[PDB]
Structure formats: C-alpha cells, structure tokens
C-alpha cells in the first residue's frame, strides 16, 4: 500500500469542467468504457444504449457473464439525474490492479443533464460509501466489492492535474505513489462514512479570515467530491466569499453573470492576469486535537477554462452556490494529491507533482495551525 505503481501513473483523462474518467472493461468479452471518477457517489452506472452525447455504451446482451437483478434504480441530482436497471457483471481496470471483480452495475436507460456532450466518458464510478448508495445500502459499492474480494488495501489516492481543454491525472488503487507528490500528506478525519465528509474549520481570502461561524462552512456538511467540478459553498458562505473576493481582486468591470457562473470572461491566450485574483485557503480539521492544516488554491484552480476560439483563453467562475452544504470539487483537488485512506478513515492532501503555480504564487498545504473549534464545526449527525 506504499511503494511505486508505475502502471497506474497517468491513467486519468478528461476535459476541463467535464471531470476525470478512467478506462474500465466490463463484461465478457470485455467491453472497454471510459468511466468518470466520482467520489461524491457510491453507484457504478453506465449508459446502456446509443446516445447523441456518447461514443459508446454498455451492451448487456453482449456480455455472457452479465446477470439482471430485474430491479430498477433512480437518482435525483445536483446536478444531472439518471435512472436505470440494476444487475451484475465482471469488472476490471486495464490501467490499474491486475484483478477482476463481479460488481453491481446500473444500466442507465434515461437521464437529464447527466451525460456531457462529447466528454468521452459513458459511465460513473461512485467511490463513496454504501450509506448513500441507491436504492439503498444493500447495494455493494464497486470499491467495497474490490476490497472484499481481492487483496487490494482499503485505500485509493487521486492526482488530478488539469491544464474544452484536455487534462490528465493518476488514480492509485490500493497504494500511495511517492513520485506523485512532495512534502507530506496532511490528513483530515472522515467525519462519517457515507460521503467522504470532512470538517472545514476556517476559510480565508488572501490571508484574511472570512469571519463566519465554524459550522457555517459545514452546513449541512462538507464533502470531497471528484465528481463535481465547482467548489460549492452554502448560501451564506458563498455570498460572503464572492463579496470578499470582489473587494480584493480589482474586478469591478466583470459582468455579474460571471459571479453566478453563467457568463464567461476571456483574455488573449497566455495573457490571463492571475495576479489580480486572490488566493483561497481552506483550513481542515487536523488529526491531533486543536490542530488544523490549510489548503491554498490559486485563480488557476477556481477559474476553469471553457466556439471557444483557438486564440483565446476563456474562463468561468468555478465557485458556485449550494443548498446541500460545501462541495470540494475537482478545482480544489487539481493542484494536489488527495489520498482517501479508507482504512484509517482519513483524507490526506499534498502538493502533487503536477502542482499549479506561476512565477509569483503556488498551491500549498500548510500546517499546523491552531483551531479550538475542531469537531464542533459540524452541524448534523
């Protein structure tokens, strides 16, 4: 669970604002499909029929090993719903562990703003815990089927790199690749095993504290969701963040739609002015009492690229409003090497090998800071 996995290095692909997908073979013979890495859910589902937005899909009748559960599933979303028919079939990850697993699989027969026009992925891989698995906990999540049936350590780390513009990354199943990051991994406790829920103890813009109550950040919860692009903030917190950001960015001429994430802003390729944007810091509950560490992201992170003409660089505000709590999306995970230590119920963060930076500032994971709020920043149970 701690060495060098050169066969999983750089096994992730995707487009900015369209998530990261990994290649998985399903069925017999093996149907090769691109599935999005979603830590914000627990269900493994794939498109079951031809779509306009998809290059391929999962042909159940093509798989002699496929078995129908003759039961359906339906998943409301924020945003992008989907529903389908449940079943089981052999699953394998070509550029990962040399293992085969018979896992649950939801053939998606219908969806709304779920799939993305030409995102080159047809399925979703819910890596979260069964408590949030639809229809209910009885449906064993893929990764749970993985560890229960193989000798893969209960752990997986991600290295989203970024930089529609194409991107790449690494998903280490079972171990920690020590060439994907520098320094150390700062772990924050998984408050509860349903989503990868954590506790944000403090938020800052350009060093300045946001001055909001601790459990305003974790209302009704904070999660680490690779399946979400944006950095979602609860109404109050979002309202304050954008205000503080405006005040410290010299950005009085930007359209208001920009802050709502509807209208883009463009500069000439390579001429983007990062220095006019503040840095955002998010302090997470540490492992030891009273201590906390922070993660610092730059505009290169919370300003994601988006017709879009060759010569221009255009961006949309990768910070949106939420009604179900805080969601630390792909924009928060890119500059870093996030580790999901399921075995020790903790999520580590570290400056990845593909850390984002410029000749002035850089993404950073710094500690230890003191927080007397700690575990009482949560809101529900």
């Amino acid at each position: 669970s701690r060495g060098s996995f050169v066969e999983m290095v750089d096994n992730l692909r995707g487009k900015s604002g369209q998530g990261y997908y990994v290649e998985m073979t399903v069925g017999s013979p093996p149907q090769t499909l691109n599935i999005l890495v979603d830590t914000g859910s627990s269900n493994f589902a794939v498109g079951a029929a031809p779509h306009p937005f998809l290059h391929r899909y999962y042909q159940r009748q093509l798989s002699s090993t496929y078995r129908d559960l003759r039961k359906g599933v339906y998943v409301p979303y924020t945003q992008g719903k989907w529903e389908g028919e449940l079943g089981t079939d052999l699953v394998s990850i070509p550029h990962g562990p040399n293992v085969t697993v018979r896992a649950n699989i939801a053939a998606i027969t219908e969806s709304d703003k779920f799939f993305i026009n030409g995102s080159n992925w047809e399925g979703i891989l819910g890596l979260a815990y069964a408590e949030i698995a639809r229809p209910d906990d009885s449906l064993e999540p893929f990764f749970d089927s993985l560890v229960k049936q193989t000798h893969v350590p209960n752990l997986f780390s991600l290295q989203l790199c970024g930089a529609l513009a194409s991107v790449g990354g690494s998903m280490i199943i079972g171990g920690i690749d020590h060439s994907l990051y520098t320094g150390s991994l700062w772990y924050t406790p998984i408050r509860r095993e349903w989503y990868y829920e954590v506790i944000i103890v403090r938020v800052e813009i350009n060093g300045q504290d946001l001055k909001m109550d601790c459990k305003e950040y974790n209302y009704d919860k904070s999660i680490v969701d690779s399946g979400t692009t944006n950095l979602r903030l609860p109404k109050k917190v979002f309202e304050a963040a954008v205000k503080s950001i405006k005040a410290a960015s010299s950005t009085e001429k930007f359209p208001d739609g920009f802050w709502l994430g509807e209208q883009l802003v463009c500069w000439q390729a390579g001429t983007t002015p990062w220095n006019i944007f503040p840095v955002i810091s998010l302090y997470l509950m540490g492992e030891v009492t009273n201590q906390s560490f922070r993660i610092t992201i730059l505009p290169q992170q919370y300003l994601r690229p988006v017709v879009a003409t060759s010569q221009d660089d255009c961006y949309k505000f990768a910070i949106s409003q939420s009604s179900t709590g805080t969601v630390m999306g792909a924009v928060i995970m890119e500059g870093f090497y996030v580790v999901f230590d399921r075995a020790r119920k903790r999520i580590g963060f570290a400056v990845s090998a593909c850390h984002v930076h410029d000749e002035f500032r850089t993404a950073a994971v710094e500690g230890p800071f003191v927080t007397l709020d700690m575990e009482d920043c949560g809101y529900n149970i």
Partner: antibody
Framework: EVQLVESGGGLVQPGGSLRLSCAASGFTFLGYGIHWVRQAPGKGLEWVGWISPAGGSTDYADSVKGRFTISADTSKNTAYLQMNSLRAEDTAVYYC????????????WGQGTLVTVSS | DIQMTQSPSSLSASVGDRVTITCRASQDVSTAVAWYQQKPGKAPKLLIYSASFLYSGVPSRFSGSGSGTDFTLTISSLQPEDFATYYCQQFPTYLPTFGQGTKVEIKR
C-alpha cells in the same frame, strides 16, 4: 482571426448626427468588452467610451457625455456608437478596441473609421 | 482626471541602441499602466500591460517597469521595425487617459 471593422465614417455637418458600427469577428465577443477611442489627425488618443455586451454596463467620457450613446447587438457581434450634435472638435479617427474586463486595456484595435465634421 | 506626461515628445536613435521612454502620472496609479505602439496610418497595438507584463506576441526586446507615478518603457535593442509613436496609459479608477505620445525615429 481576431478583427474589428468600424463603419459609418464620413462627412458630417456641424450639429449633425452620425452612427458608427463595430463588426466583431474571430474572437469570443461575449467575454470581452468594447472600448471606443478617437484620435485627431496628428494628435494623440482620447478614450471616448466603453461597454460590456453582457450586459451594459456602459461608460462614457465627459467630452461625449450626453451626446454619444453606445449600443451593442450581441446577435450580430456588433457594437454601435450613436453620435449627436457633432461639432468640429469631434473630427478624429474613431477606433473601437477589444477590452478585457481587467485590466482595462485594449489589446486589439481596429483600423478605425475617419469622421469629419465640416461645412 | 489623471494626467499622463510622457518624455520626451520625440527622439532619434540608431539600430541597436538602448532607448528609454518615461511616463509620469499626476497621481499614484499603482501599477495600472499600459504601453502601446502605433505605426503612422495604422492602428495602435498593445505592447505592455500592468506596467511590466508583455503582451502575447510582443518581442522580448520590449521592457516595461515602474510604480506610483514613475513608469518607464525600454527597448534594449532598437530595430528598424520599431519606428512608431509610443503611448502610456492609466486605468486604476477606470477613467483611461493616455500620454501625449513619443515618436521614435530610426537613424541609419
């Protein structure tokens, strides 16, 4: 290919009205703004106005304040400049330039349209 | 209404020389400054933005610097194609005003 094309330039009577256009092409219209700048023959530059086609968000200079009215057609990728009560002092080359919301600079200028107020 | 006094109004240098053009703001304009080039008859092109950041496609021999009121544009190695009139600009309060220009002629 990034390019702006002004129009409407010509002879105008003192106290007359003229309407200049600014055809945008080859770049993401929405995402930038459009400045209007003028320059007399042999003289320097003088920022005339600005607009954000998403959505104005219009800004003028005291010189043209109350006479010039900036318009924008996002359907046609075109910014307009309505000019009224034109005096001789208004004679100048009128450039429209692409403008990043920040910094407030003009990165691509059109070759302009010459306007001459004369009897 | 901020004012921009460039200096000098004109100059003539030889190919290769180090030419420096200075611009003075009538008030602290931080770093909100730009520099344009304009060939006679042609439109102005952006060279430097935010005082010292070159625009995409602008040669390396063009250099900007300064803060507050004293900003300077420098052309380390003058070239024939650098003949033009140069302008500085301010926009900290979003009320842009340019300098009176500086025609740089070539000696041969």
């Amino acid at each position: 290919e990034v390019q702006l094309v002004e129009s409407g330039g010509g002879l105008v009577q003192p106290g007359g009205s003229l309407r200049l256009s600014c055809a945008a092409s080859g770049f993401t219209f929405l995402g930038y703004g459009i400045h209007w700048v003028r320059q007399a023959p042999g003289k320097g530059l003088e920022w005339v106005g600005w607009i954000s086609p998403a959505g104005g968000s219009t800004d003028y200079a005291d010189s043209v304040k109350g006479r010039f009215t900036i318009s924008a057609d996002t359907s046609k990728n075109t910014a307009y400049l309505q000019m009224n009560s034109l005096r001789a002092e208004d004679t100048a080359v009128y450039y429209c330039a692409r403008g990043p919301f920040s910094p407030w600079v003009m990165d691509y200028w059109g070759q302009g349209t010459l306007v001459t107020v004369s009897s | 209404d901020i004012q921009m006094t460039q200096s000098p109004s004109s100059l003539s240098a030889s190919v290769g020389d180090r030419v420096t053009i200075t611009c003075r703001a009538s008030q602290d304009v931080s770093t909100a400054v730009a520099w344009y080039q304009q060939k006679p008859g042609k439109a102005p092109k952006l060279l430097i933005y935010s005082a010292s950041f070159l625009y995409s496609g602008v040669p390396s021999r063009f250099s900007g610097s300064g803060s507050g009121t004293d900003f300077t544009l420098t052309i380390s190695s003058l070239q024939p194609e650098d003949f033009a009139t140069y302008y500085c600009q301010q926009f900290p309060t979003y009320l842009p005003t340019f300098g009176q220009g500086t025609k740089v002629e070539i000696k041969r």
